[PDB]
Amino acid sequence: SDWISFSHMSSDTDHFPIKSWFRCEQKAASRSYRTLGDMSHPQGIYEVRAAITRLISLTRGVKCRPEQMIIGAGTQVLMQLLTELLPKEAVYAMEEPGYRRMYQLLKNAGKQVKTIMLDEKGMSIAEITRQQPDVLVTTPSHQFPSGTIMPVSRRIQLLNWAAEEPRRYIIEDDYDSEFTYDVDSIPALQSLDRFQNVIYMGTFSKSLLPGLRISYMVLPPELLRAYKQRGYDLQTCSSLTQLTLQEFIESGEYQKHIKKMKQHYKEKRERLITALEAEFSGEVTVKGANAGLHFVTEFDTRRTEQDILSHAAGLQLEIFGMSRFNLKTGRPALIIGFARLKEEDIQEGVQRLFKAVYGHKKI
Amino acid sequence: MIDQSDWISFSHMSSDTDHFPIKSWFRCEQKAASRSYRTLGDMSHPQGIYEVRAAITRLISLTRGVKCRPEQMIIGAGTQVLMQLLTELLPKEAVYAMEEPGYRRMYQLLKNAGKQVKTIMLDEKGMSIAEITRQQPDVLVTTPSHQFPSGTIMPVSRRIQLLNWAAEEPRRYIIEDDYDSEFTYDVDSIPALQSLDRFQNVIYMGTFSKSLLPGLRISYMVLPPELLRAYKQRGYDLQTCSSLTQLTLQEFIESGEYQKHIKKMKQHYKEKRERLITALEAEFSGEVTVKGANAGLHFVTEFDTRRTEQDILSHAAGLQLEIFGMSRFNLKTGRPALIIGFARLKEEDIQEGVQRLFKAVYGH
Ligand SMILES: Cc1ncc(/C=C/c2nnn[nH]2)c(/C=N/[C@@H](CCC(=O)O)COc2ccccc2)c1O
Ligand SMILES: Cc1ncc(/C=C/c2nnn[nH]2)c(/C=N/[C@@H](CCC(=O)O)COc2ccccc2)c1O
């Protein structure tokens, strides 16, 4: 195929060390084959949880005991489980724009879900305070999709809000947090909390592969108590997959991989920005590009988003429109992911985009 | 002394890691990866990769006569996630009914979702249609190929009474849980209940987690059109089975490795069951009643003994014999009945195992 991907929901496969991953799986398998049908703790194998605990304490400042952690095949199963540990009449609140899939999950569960618009610092604490929800879903590292990084002041506002009344919860979806360009790392919301009002949720899908689904969540001890009272849950990650993750982490292959990828995506992001800036000269507006694996581009042009995307599809440019992320007019806005984008396709990538916005490039 | 490690297991909740072709599984995974690596980076179709679903569909039509299209099938990491999903596709206020004795874990899942769950006793033909029509549930959970745990194979005639019952009123459904259906022994090679479902009241539930790599959970669910339509209305589900685990399973099947393994295992289990039956019959000479064999990986033993089912169980730990009593499969009182599972039982251990059991039962 001659497709070029500006997709945010695909991941790199050319730079993921799949041979290392398989070697770790062989090493795990050799270490624990006798017990493979035995290590089935519903929360995840303890040592896997401890390995992830150590990792996210180092790289995110998350503080927690392995016993608080729950591993799962993907963020959806963990979220669904979460909605059953939280009070059943909890009013939820989601960033708009945001993760519509999760919006739909909460609606389908019959939950009330308020939509909290963004401002320059991320999820609006004014809309939060006005609408008085019980549970926040927020993406502080790199707002999904707008790309805004929640500054520390706004984190503190959200935590003060959770702290002012019993039984308010912040679900911190730290998706896309493994990378930070032209700015340093901000400690996680969970890390700043002087209390225990944050559920930390992380995923390995952006850093290993969507193909494999591994996610986890760190419960505040009281939601852990409700979880432990259930008595019937089964782990959804295969034991060998968990042990492979453990070996991949404790061998150092994981941290080696992230470091190399941090450099790769930084240079890719820079070059892709320069190329968008030369091709569009000033008629592109780029925002949300200080972290994560995508940013936003707004375009000064006359066609609809449904049209610009319909042309790009014809021109074999995989790209998505910002309208997809309304939970529910202006100039067209698109999501440029660059995780799957080959460096050698950057120049030809913007062209096709510079042509999907209308149909040409006369110069 | 009394070697502490010398445990013999009669437990049903197992699968012989020893006998699984682990190297063939990894070679299939490697072949899948060579063919499709540039595809792991994509998002699986939410139902599961089509070609995986198609391979499973071809398999279960051959091996069970299930009649379905890959389009109807939903892959998931274990039966529980699929059952949770199912409870959300079925009407909120649906009234469920499960076999008693049965699978406590699914009972707990349903009750924790706030569902009314009826418990339905067995007769000689399995789940009691008479109790079903008395207690008036909407959705049945049943194990027709080999009732868990009594081991009764529901005969065609009772299958038809269930199908008739479901067709009589709107919003009835039959969940066919076809666990441990990869094995039958010399009788009752009867196809899936779903193969008779002229009116689309059946949801077929199958699983590989007994057949494949220990610790791996791959299950699937075949949905009738109205529930499939309800599933497509959601628009937000993410496939829980790793794409590469799906592609390995597909290679395992289409390379023939999967069926080769089942033929071998089936043979192994038929002989092990035979040898274990001959031994129980020799040791107990009629003071034992075996029922619920001819399929699966466990059967039931009723014992000719003044001892308590709980006295036998506690003496059994005292002999390093891991065994389970029928009493543990009540959801929520006479001759003692035990579940003999021979999944993780060594042929070396058959003669010792029944002799230990004889002293669990009688004390001498
Ligand atoms: C804020 C947020 N929170 C969780 C997830 C999903 C998590 C997960 N964790 N484990 N499994 N799934 C997503 C992304 N969702 C998909 C597309 C969004 C959409 O356009 O709908 C992309 O999925 C991935 C693709 C490649 C790599 C990693 C994720 C997300 O934006
Ligand atoms: C009627 C029925 N339906 C599905 C499943 C499991 C499905 C699955 N697939 N993937 N993930 N979960 C089981 C599980 N039974 C286990 C629990 C025993 C208990 O405590 O009662 C024991 O293991 C087995 C023993 C004998 C046969 C099969 C399994 C079951 O009984």
Swiss-Prot record, chain A:
A Gene Ontology molecular function term of the record: transaminase activity
Coiled coil: none
Keywords, in A-Z order: Activator, Aminotransferase, DNA-binding, Pyridoxal phosphate, Repressor, Transcription, Transcription regulation, Transferase
Named cofactor requirement(s): pyridoxal 5'-phosphate
N6-(pyridoxal phosphate)lysine: modified positions: 206
Function noted in UniProt: Activates the transcription of the gabTD operon. Is also a repressor of its own expression, both in the presence and absence of GABA. Binds specifically to the DNA region overlapping the -35 region of the gabT promoter and the -10 and +1 regions of the gabR promoter. Principally regulates the utilization of gamma-aminobutyrate.
Family in the record: In the C-terminal section; belongs to the class-I pyridoxal-phosphate-dependent aminotransferase family.
Protein name: HTH-type transcriptional regulatory protein GabR
Top-level taxonomy: Bacteria, Bacillati, Bacillota, Bacilli, Bacillales
Curated annotation (Swiss-Prot), chain B:
Residues of the full protein shown: 104 to 471 of 479
Claim: Transferase is one of the keywords in the record: yes
UniProt family annotation: In the C-terminal section; belongs to the class-I pyridoxal-phosphate-dependent aminotransferase family.
GO biological process, one term: biosynthetic process
Lineage top rank: taxon: Bacteria
Record bears the keyword Flavoprotein: no
Cofactors (names): pyridoxal 5'-phosphate
Higher taxonomy: Bacteria, Bacillati, Bacillota, Bacilli, Bacillales
Positions of post-translational N6-(pyridoxal phosphate)lysine modification: 210
Biological function: Activates the transcription of the gabTD operon. Is also a repressor of its own expression, both in the presence and absence of GABA. Binds specifically to the DNA region overlapping the -35 region of the gabT promoter and the -10 and +1 regions of the gabR promoter. Principally regulates the utilization of gamma-aminobutyrate.
Protein's UniProt name: HTH-type transcriptional regulatory protein GabR
Entry keywords, A to Z: Activator, Aminotransferase, DNA-binding, Pyridoxal phosphate, Repressor, Transcription, Transcription regulation, Transferase
Single GO molecular function: transaminase activity
Coiled coil: none
